[PDB]
Subunit: 125 residues, 4 copies
Amino acid sequence: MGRDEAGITGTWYNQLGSTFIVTAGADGALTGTYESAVGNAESRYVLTGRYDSAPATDGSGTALGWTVAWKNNYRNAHSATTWSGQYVGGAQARINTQWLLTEGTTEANAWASTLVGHDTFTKVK
Amino acid sequence: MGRDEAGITGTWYNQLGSTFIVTAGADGALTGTYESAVGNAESRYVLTGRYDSAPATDGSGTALGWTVAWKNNYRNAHSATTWSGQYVGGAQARINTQWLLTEGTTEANAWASTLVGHDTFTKVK
Amino acid sequence: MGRDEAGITGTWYNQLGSTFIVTAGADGALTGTYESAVGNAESRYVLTGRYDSAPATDGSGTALGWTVAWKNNYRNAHSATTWSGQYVGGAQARINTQWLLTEGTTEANAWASTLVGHDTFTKVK
Amino acid sequence: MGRDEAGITGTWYNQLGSTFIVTAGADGALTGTYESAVGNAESRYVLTGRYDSAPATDGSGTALGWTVAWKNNYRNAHSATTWSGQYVGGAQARINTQWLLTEGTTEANAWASTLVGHDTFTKVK
């Protein structure tokens, strides 16, 4: 059982009103679904990622990351987002992330392929 | 069969001499192993990610991303990297990425939790 | 007179308790001083940057950016931070930024040269 | 006289064919003009920034950064780019950077305000 397997598993919400549904495996796996409240997206998309299943015991957060490719049965935005961040446990548990959103482009437009931003996920809202 | 399933599957190398071994699934899954030539890393680490299995047919690249958590049987760097980028097929196939490397930190040090960089992967070297 | 010259000029504070003192010029210049509450920093450092002196009139924010090199009479952290973001005017005025912090490194360590993060500045606190 | 004042001052070119014309001051200032070969840009734009005028003497690079707001007499792209990076001196001198490009947006679109990328500048091409 990963140190924060129970803390990470469940339904999370970010500041945009997106919904992150994840299961943390004992082995370090993250699996689930993502629903974006914004952008060229509708309904759920598959996500997969990894987390540190044996984090530091000095009060540090737990490093994790995941990917969504923005293709499902409804839409294809020809793009993928990766979130990189840390889980911080406790009464007001949080996942604090930064993300990179890449779209497929021509070589001439590849300089403009990637958005960067930050999302904070909580168990409420 | 994903449009670039065959193009993406295989062994890739970046400019640091790291080795990315990946299998692309028909469903959009990426699975495999990563070996970093640099940093607090030794041997292989599990990776998982996603790719656009039906990309644009206008000469755009194929969006993809993946995650490594830097824990294996040898070491634990209490960190995770996510790569976000695009696959560009052809004689000199490439995966062009940007990445985010987050370490677990205390809340006081969380401003300094995340490195950013860029890796280019080719099928040779 | 830049559209938001008066709105941007003044003393700003971020979520870390750092202090950003800036003058916006009619020509698009930003000049002032930065004092970091965290990291290898003490007292004030010179800053310079630019802003859009004729922003869109459709309720969009005002794009701006600035640089600090972390050398002053007290310390030299051999690093520079750049903030890129937008000014949003009104009762609860804000500057919403993302930043890149580069340290001088050897070529072997250059993959690890750059931190990324996000700061929100307000006129209170 | 800054350690790399003479090395940094001059005309630089990146991989897109953009032109960076800069003067490094003894005090740590960068001033000059930028001409982008791509995007919503024409002719020269003002730039300002900072560099470490007393870098480490252990073979590390020299940290620097600069800003362009994409307004000139010809066009206004309501955006600003900041480059953060390091200068590496020698026969094949380089400035290795990462950048953040923010556009002014509405609050509803602010998640999508910022591009990230990387530019390498050389004294030839």
